[PDB]
Design a binder for this molecule. Structure first.
Ligand code: HEC
Length: 108
């Protein structure tokens, strides 16, 4: 199914274990391997200030919402062929819902 609100509490733990190694969520957080995700929802892909993306990520030009984020996070490389995000995906729909619920709030 499409996105449905889950548990931000569980999503934060998922973020810590699966994402935090490469990403920050806070405005002005440290620079990492992946782009700062502050403000990601409602922004097009490839637009974080001062980050060097693949051409693939820029050219996809997806306007990130909670539904296409769930599709992307299922399998990043299938959604954006050639992306340099070294992440196979979140297989479980419940995990995607929980993570995205946390991410939507934490990146405000
Ligand atoms: C490093 C080992 C990473 C892990 C673990 C995760 N991400 Fe990532 N992400 C990473 C890179 C290097 C990039 C840039 C990709 C490119 O081709 O240029 C990304 C990109 C994203 C994006 C897109 C951001 C945009 O502005 O378009 C998102 C939304 C994203 N990453 C989210 C994300 C989440 C939620 C993770 C855990 C589940 C995660 N990433 C892991 C590097 C790495």
């Amino acid at each position: 199914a499409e996105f449905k609100a889950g548990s931000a509490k569980k999503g934060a733990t998922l973020f810590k274990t699966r994402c935090l190694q490469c990403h920050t969520v806070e405005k002005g957080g440290p620079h990492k391997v992946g782009p700062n995700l502050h403000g990601i929802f409602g922004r097009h892909s490839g637009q974080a200030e001062g980050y060097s993306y693949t051409d693939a990520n820029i050219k996809k030009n997806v306007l990130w919402d909670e539904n296409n984020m769930s599709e992307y996070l299922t399998n990043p490389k299938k959604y954006i062929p050639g992306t340099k995000m070294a992440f196979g995906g979140l297989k479980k729909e419940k995990d995607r819902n929980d993570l995205i619920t946390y991410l939507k709030k934490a990146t405000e």
